[PDB]
Amino acid sequence: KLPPGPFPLPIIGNLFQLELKNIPKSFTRLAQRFGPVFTLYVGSQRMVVMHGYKAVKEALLDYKDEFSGRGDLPAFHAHRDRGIIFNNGPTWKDIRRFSLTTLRNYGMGNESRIQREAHFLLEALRKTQGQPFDPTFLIGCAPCNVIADILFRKHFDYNDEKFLRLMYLFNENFHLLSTPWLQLYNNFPSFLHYLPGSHRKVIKNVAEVKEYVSERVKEHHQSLDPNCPRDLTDCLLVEMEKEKHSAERLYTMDGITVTVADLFFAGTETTSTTLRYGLLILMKYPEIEEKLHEEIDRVIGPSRIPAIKDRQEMPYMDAVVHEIQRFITLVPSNLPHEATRDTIFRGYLIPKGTVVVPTLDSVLYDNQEFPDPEKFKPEHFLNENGKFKYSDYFKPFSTGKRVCAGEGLARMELFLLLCAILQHFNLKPLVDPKDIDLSPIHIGFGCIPPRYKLCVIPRS
């Protein structure tokens, strides 16, 4: 017996119960008709959605091994069953475990890297000279580089036409992946794939970044010395040669290229966007900026670069960084899991290959944990005491076996960089803080911020 749900129409399915502009809201809406676990057929594809902290945790922490799979995402057939994110293969487990180990070994190291990078952000920011600018392609360079150094020991100038091109692709794709047409293409790929439409643009872009990353991996291989692995890409290559004789294969050149692409855009566009929501948020609530400045000055001074150990000393900063991520629910629907082996969830049988959706926004907007969850309120992570307060509901990276791999670097990237930009700059909205609308402009894959420009006016 499957989890409850709407009666599915022929072919179409339960797509009338779905608003493509905004799926998560549809989930929320269905959650209140059928409770915490429900069944949806979209296309022929049959999915199970969990809504709310109890249901989502159970899914992600209790049935780790059962909901191990990764639902398919047709935009990314280019990536499927390879790398990590889109790997629903027998390949998945080890190439993840290895990169995760490697990301660890490059991270103790990570602090310095972000710190080094910050230098350039500030430089690029002063250069705007208190004028209006679109930050999308200023602030995004920082995560990009940080990852570029881990990935290819490569550094970019904030004006390399290729660099900017890669960022544009990441933005174009995130943008596009959160719009209706791709939501539908996501679930009816065979019907739509050869019809015209922006699904074609996404594919073209996925292919462009894969090609580029591909070339870099070949460059690496052609020059690889296995004693001196220069970066991540290297560490992978040496595993690829370590077993050229092994009959059955784990690392193929493609395999690596996908793995690398995965962290490349992953490390870049998630943190860039989050940072950009942060900045916009902070311009809505100038009094929070002011409070934050006070702390930076009190605890770090107007000079010394922010460090990880200052976080324990700064609870307003901390909480802000948290609420930023909680409020904006970047991956509001989580990334799609698949049921691996025939499974019993609460009452219900969940067949094999079922797309399991453990919805994050439903966790992040608990109106018990976070009273007025719809409001941006640092207090959500503060206790009446003024110190930091941790929430078990803070899971915008998810949890369990597919927990975001770049979490540590994400977390650090946000706090440090944000810290930096505020330490040296005040934020200027070009519209009244009263007229700033924080609502995403698209909701699918991700939650996407209004385009906006701003001024940064120095503090030294």
Ligand code: HEM
């Ligand atoms: C704002 C920062 C980020 C957020 C909110 C975020 C969120 C997520 C979420 C929700 C998932 C899916 C978890 C699931 O399937 O249950 C995921 C997966 C993943 N993330 Fe992130 N992520 C972020 C940054 C990063 C960064 C910086 C990297 C690389 C440095 C990265 C690499 C990955 C990879 C490789 C996966 C695939 C998970 C798997 O092994 O199946 N992410 N992330």
Ligand SMILES: O=C(O)CCCCCCCCCCCn1ccnc1
């Ligand atoms: O060619 C390619 O493979 C790269 C082009 C795809 C760029 C799309 C960026 C989407 C934003 C990712 C946010 C979701 N996420 C991923 C990992 N953790 C969260």
